[PDB]
């Protein structure tokens, strides 16, 4: 709903660019502050600064000053803020939430108006850091060794693996399961490519023999994947 | 407001689907009758704008 | 700098217990109007946040009152009463008050972890990512209690780990429950070939880490 809430999603590697957009509604170009976020996975939220988007003035966060761009694209309703120099580091969630409006009679460029406490739709974003083993889906069998499988505690099938396209809809549950699930998650390895561990629960001679597989489409790198990862 | 039959009194427990001490159902019977009092007595009204 | 910081960190009740989340800030909140320029905010998994109080006190359209408070000068409790289904978010505190502001370090509110362990299903992988990759021990858990969690991932059966890394789910089981995943270093032969590899898993009411493992040849 709220046109200035953020939108778009990149991946970059260290010393690239990156870029970003928004919309002339709700918290419009007429309406608030345009002060874009980001916040790490691991993390709170921190300032990329605050614009005014027509005529386009601007305060930046002084940790990030040589590493910043700003647009009053206002014609195009964005508020098209920008990055240089990335980081692996730098690899974050980024958001568009609006200022709370001015406050006051007066007129001009307000700011002074606000802070960490953005007060509209951040609606949010992804900027990758492409540093990472870049690399196409794979769904590891998570199903057990021989002194874990065939018993009533275990769980089958397989979970995204080996690409920094980390993220896939892996979980044991593609088709040859669709419930039962453990939400293992698919974490990084050291080479930011994942290592996932989900595995879908099974009676105990499934457990030991079933067709289970896991829908492991690497997301980031938008290729299908169905692999099978059978116990025993 | 309220033009539903849902559960509704509820909201520090999780509301699943028992109607009973978990999360009751509001809209109970309205059934007024002649052998109550003329307060109790229902009545059948309209109201227009 | 302003430093808005929050006090619990996380909260770990059972749903519908009273709480509250506290911050303060270093210093300067009132603006000498004396509004008190602070705000309270959530977002649970993988949602943008958004406010639940603004101006210190002002509630967010169609808050819950028991899940909302005040701020006071450089302190502020916001509310947790009633602890309601599905509010279970990271939560903190921000600062309107001028350009550098922070947000306050996004305390998780949580589900009371019940005493349950994890299943024991972990082993290292089927012959796909084992004997065509490595027979590392490979780790994981099914319905968890978080609060005190543990896991296993290392060579020669040592029902222990260091050389290795983990991940959990959202507390969504009725336990506060959470599955898990983990992996170990080991050579892709050696792993397997010890006496054991280990796989464990344990909860915050666990005696000891759940027997999940590959005997030696059978990873």
């Known amino acids: 709903q709220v046109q200035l809430v953020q939108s778009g999603a990149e991946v970059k590697k260290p010393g690239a660019s990156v870029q970003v957009s928004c919309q002339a509604s709700?918290?419009?170009?007429?309406?608030?502050?345009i002060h874009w976020v980001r916040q790490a996975p691991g993390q709170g939220l921190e300032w990329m600064g605050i614009?005014?988007?027509?005529?386009?003035?601007?305060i930046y966060a002084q940790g990030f000053q040589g590493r910043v761009t700003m647009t009053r694209d206002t014609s195009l309703n964005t508020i098209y803020l920008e990055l240089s120099s990335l980081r692996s580091e730098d690899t974050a969630v980024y958001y568009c939430?609006?200022?709370?409006?001015?406050?006051?009679?007066?007129?001009?460029?307000?700011?002074?108006?606000?802070?960490?406490?953005?007060?509209?739709w951040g609606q949010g974003t992804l900027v990758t850091v492409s540093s990472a083993s870049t690399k196409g889906p794979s769904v590891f069998p998570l199903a057990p060794s021989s002194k874990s499988t065939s018993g009533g505690t275990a769980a089958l099938g397989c979970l995204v693996k080996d690409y920094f396209p980390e993220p896939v809809t892996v979980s044991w549950n593609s088709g040859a399961l669709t419930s039962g699930v453990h939400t293992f998650p698919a974490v990084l390895q050291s080479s930011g490519l994942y290592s996932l561990s989900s595995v879908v629960t099974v009676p105990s001679s499934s457990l030991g023999t079933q067709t289970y597989i896991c829908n492991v489409n690497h997301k980031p790198s938008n290729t299908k994947v169905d692999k099978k990862v059978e116990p025993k | 407001r309220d033009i539903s039959e849902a559960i509704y009194q509820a909201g520090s427990t999780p509301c699943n689907g028992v109607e009973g001490y978990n999360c009751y159902f509001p809209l109970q019977s309205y059934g007024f009758q002649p052998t109550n009092g003329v307060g109790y007595q229902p009545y059948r009204v309209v109201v227009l704008s | 700098d302003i430093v808005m910081t929050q006090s619990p960190d996380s909260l770990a009740v059972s749903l519908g217990e009273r709480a509250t989340i506290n911050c303060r800030s270093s210093?300067?909140?009132?603006?000498?109007?004396?509004?008190?320029?602070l705000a309270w905010y959530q977002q649970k998994p993988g949602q943008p946040p958004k406010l639940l109080i603004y101006?210190?006190?002002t509630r967010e359209s169609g808050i819950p009152d028991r899940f909302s408070g005040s701020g006071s000068g450089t302190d502020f409790t916001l509310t947790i009463s009633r602890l309601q289904a599905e509010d279970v978010a990271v939560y903190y505190c921000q600062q309107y008050y001028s350009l550098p502001r922070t947000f306050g370090q996004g305390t998780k509110v949580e589900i009371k972890r019940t005493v349950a362990a994890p299943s024991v299903f972990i082993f290292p992988p089927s012959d796909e990512q084992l004997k065509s990759g490595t027979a590392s021990v490979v780790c994981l858990l099914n319905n968890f209690y978080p609060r005190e969690a543990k896991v296993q991932w290392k060579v020669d059966n040592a029902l222990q780990s260091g050389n290795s890394q983990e991940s959990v789910t959202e507390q969504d089981s009725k336990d506060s429950t959470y599955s898990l995943s983990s992996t170990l270093t080991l050579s892709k032969a050696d792993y397997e070939k010890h006496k054991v590899y280990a796989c464990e898993v344990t909860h915050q009411g666990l005696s000891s880490p759940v027997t999940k493992s590959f005997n030696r040849g059978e990873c």
């Open positions: 709700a918290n419009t170009f007429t309406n608030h502050y």
């Open positions: 614009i005014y988007p027509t005529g386009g003035n601007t």
């Open positions: 939430a609006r200022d709370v409006r001015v406050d006051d009679s007066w007129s001009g460029y307000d700011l002074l108006s606000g802070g960490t406490y953005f007060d509209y």
């Open positions: 101006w210190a006190s």
């Open positions: 210093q300067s909140v009132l603006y000498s109007n004396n509004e008190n320029y």
